[PDB]
Subunit: 334 residues, 4 copies
């Protein structure tokens, strides 16, 4: 009587989603894993992780499956999309995490192959409902067959933006994310058609990049439509990012009142989504942290009673994968 999912794309997100499913003993049953390489190599990448340490030492690859005691997850290596056997496997939700099927027309092919629902682990183009846990996820409708979990940056900015919005109101906001390197970057200078800068050596450079997170916050928080914009800098760390939010609030307030508002949210409405800290934290302190947004109280500054610069950390890998598991469990219960 549990939820049957498959993971399409066993990458950073796909593998860590399975890790988080196992780490919490979720009732979700992972039925199949699809990627481009054989299961023995995927099992290796699942067991060994340069960022998050080793996992499941007893996990083994046997007979085309990932064997973990009695749990057996079927490995697949199909690229034609239409040849995925979701009808035979009775797939409830496809976790679409390849990074290549962000268009709704592309994601709809999983539905044609027998899947009942599709969860895109990235911002999606087209009429795709997008949810951020703790912000607008209760707006999920059982009739939505293709949904998105937004980006990791949106999951960091949106909760903070909601606390500021509900408590003080927002007039204007300009956001910067100092972002860890991701798989789309290059080890040495190479070509990247969509963004030339992104092909430059990932660990030699601070790399400016665009982001849609600020506009995305305007979708799950419609009162913020047209009030936020942003940019990004890619920097040589392998994981963990930070949001730098410069905001003009609608009401006069103090930095203490903002801290108290975020602290109160982290203990109530934003429980397990936002975290509030006053420690002298650095990025590596958040490797493995599962919150969407960790408010850095000592880092922020106030210019006057309406202009502030606020700092919020996030493990762009683990925090996002955990939100995927949270959203899946919410969809099963609705």
């Amino acid at each position: 009587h549990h939820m049957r999912i498959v993971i399409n794309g066993f990458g950073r997100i796909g593998r860590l989603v399975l890790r988080q499913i196992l780490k919490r003993n979720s009732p979700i049953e992972v039925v199949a894993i699809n990627d481009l390489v054989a299961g023995d190599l995927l099992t290796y990448l699942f067991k060994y992780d340069s960022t998050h340490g080793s996992f499941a030492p007893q996990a083994t690859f046997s007979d085309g499956c990932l064997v973990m005691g009695e749990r057996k997850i079927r490995f697949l290596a199909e690229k034609d999309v239409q040849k995925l056997p979701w009808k035979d496997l009775d797939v409830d939700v496809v976790v679409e995490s390849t990074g290549l099927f962000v268009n709704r027309d592309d994601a709809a092919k999983h539905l044609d192959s027998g899947a009942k629902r599709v969860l895109i682990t990235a911002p999606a183009k087209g009429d795709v409902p997008t949810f951020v846990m703790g912000v607008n996820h209760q707006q999920f409708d059982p009739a939505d067959v293709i949904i998105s979990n937004a980006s990791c940056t949106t999951n960091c900015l949106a909760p903070l933006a909601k606390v500021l919005l509900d408590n003080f109101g927002i007039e204007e906001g300009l956001m910067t994310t100092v972002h860890a390197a991701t798989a789309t970057q290059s080890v040495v200078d190479g070509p990247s058609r969509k963004d030339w800068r992104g092909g430059r050596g990932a660990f030699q450079n601070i790399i400016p990049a665009s982001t849609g997170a600020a506009k995305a916050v305007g979708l799950c928080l419609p009162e913020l439509k047209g009030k936020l914009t942003g940019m990004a800098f890619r920097v040589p760390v392998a994981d963990v990012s930070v949001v730098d939010l410069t905001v003009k609030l609608s009401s006069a307030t103090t930095y203490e009142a903002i801290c108290e508002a975020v602290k109160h949210a982290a203990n109530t409405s934003m429980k397990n989504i936002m975290y509030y800290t006053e420690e002298a934290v650095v990025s590596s302190d958040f490797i493995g942290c599962e919150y969407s947004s960790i408010f850095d109280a000592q880092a922020g500054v106030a210019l006057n009673d309406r202009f502030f610069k606020l700092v919020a950390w996030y493990d762009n890998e683990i925090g996002y994968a955990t939100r995927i598991v949270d959203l899946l469990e919410y969809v099963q219960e609705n």
Copy 2:
């Protein structure tokens, strides 16, 4: 009568100051070099540089001097300040680049040892006039015996702030600098009494840090007093930093008009101080660049006709060292 200077602290700044003096064939004569290690080791660090490449292959250390053809610079290794022979060497300006004499009372010890003037290559505490080339350096008075060149970050933000001030006015400004690692940081987690986060491993972490640039810009541009605030993030690159300036202007404008104002300033009032580019630049492209502030036209964003986020690069080593040589030559001419 040429200017006779000495370099106190032959570190990143001290060595690159000598490089830039020689690279331009300046009439400034370096009389002595003071540091904690022998001259043979200092000559080695002068000839080989992990960031800026090898320099002066014919340079050699002989008889306690740095021999470069006919130029001979005396090496010193005194730390008690009071034993430095600046009176016998007829020192016009001491380039104070140890990082330890930022207080005016400490820097005044060079004057007691025979120096006529002291230039602190960092923000200074006390009544020390601070100058930014292209912003307020013409306010230098020959009666000023202890002067400062502000920080590298202030030299990047102040020219951009002046252009914005003169053309559109500034109501509010919130600045973030994504800054390269510097010598005060640590290779692995260690203690840093004044700045706990700064002792964490420099190349494992995004490290939040405070900055005095926003307050310093309010001093050399008094119309911006109380209008600017800022913070910093230290990231794993060995050189080159970038200013992220969120500014609300006093009058409505377009992003194109801002670009045109900076472009024109770089060709006129900010000649050899600011540079304007529209190229797809990343940080390593500015290694060796001598400008104080390089406006990145494609990286910036606009929220509306008064609220913008602007991006300006700087080689925190070479750009600052070049401004030191510029300020010395200006002081010499007045």
Copy 3:
């Protein structure tokens, strides 16, 4: 009764030694911690670690002590050694991990201040017995008041050398260690009187360095005197190193037989000292690993039946700190 120790130098090794004492619930009682800064900063560095994650979340700094439930460790900040109160604190062993008292005459001052024994966490100059767990530690004499645990590299090479010696004999051995960066290195190019190359930017360079491990192995394994030599390369990783041992054995053998010899030792005589793996391991896979020497079976190569190149990993921080605790527990029982 139980052993009372103090940690002189609360650095990478000093903190991880305390961490390893607690992780195994050792009967060793840490009575005092001495370093250069106050206990609140030392507590912060103990709780947060860029390389090994956070630890002891309920640990607090209070009244100049490190409070962990009912365990209370006194914090000290004395550097003059002769003013250290080891007589009043009833100190059995000083864990000397500052890196500054490697000479026996310097370490003997801990005895003059009231300590009964000194364990130097580094190679030591003078008549200091040096021990490698699993190789020669049973040669410890209760009369030895100042002892050494050798280097991290010696603790990796010596166990492997012993297995090769006992099974096949060694005619010649030439060792290279590709070593992680350590606290003696620099973030940017700076002066290093003892080692000019070591002052160059730690994360910009492969940096050649000398090593005493090969000679140190010749002391705890006298049959190898004059048969081993070595060098090192420091590379931009924050932790985990690897030994590259080129060895010509005394008798003909196969690479499979070497693997079986090491694997067999790991299950018996070298239990918890050596580990044997055939996995496709990389350096980060050994972060947190407690073995002194992990044999990388698939990475090594054979030239012929007597000349081999063998690969052995070690977490130079955690592996060595664990051996410190192992040596301390052995000394208590003897």
Copy 4:
């Protein structure tokens, strides 16, 4: 003059063009083939994170790389058979994609009209392999498909030849501590050939195999079966170092080795080997054009026959310079 084309405008392809221009070589680059448009390729040629900016007046215009009066046609064909080497007067195709290392793959350039193909990597099959300063004079004008070996082979082979000619070699085991390359990953990902090579390049020391030791046995047949080796990939963007443990055939001293290498660097190995006694680190060789820089102070001696020797090389610039050197030698022969 000699007319060449560059197939694969990557790290090697671009720096080869950079080295041709830096020396004002008579070689004329007729066309450039890659997967992306010329404007992006022009950008990557002008800006380089490792070796700095170059050719500021260069621009992409009318599908060409324009540099004053030089105009290089840009191509973006992947089907090989659709490359117009017959219409062009192509003398040598610089095969630098990394994907056509087999002779059967390289022979397709000949089918399109090219007169010769130079594979910028170790090649499988009956492909003559040359190392400048070691065996390049064995080049035969009848050789239509040739190889320049690897960057690691170009560092090890000159040192091995000096040791071979002066003292003889009994046995040798080589390790290269190697900079990260384009085949690696920024974060942990799949790599079918070498699983370890897909792990995060700048988080890890990564063991890897190498064929350099066997390749030295080809250009120096007296060393066949006497050398073996391995590699460690480490988090630097450029410059690698060879760690050669060798048993020599005759008793000698470390000073005699240094003097032999120093002597070769001044004569037979001029502009191929360099001899230094400075306190060098890897970044000091960024831009260095020698194939093999002997690090005199880093090496150690065990006895009068067993030594461990250290030789640096810029795996990008040194290799690209040897490509241009080999091309200029082939043109004159």
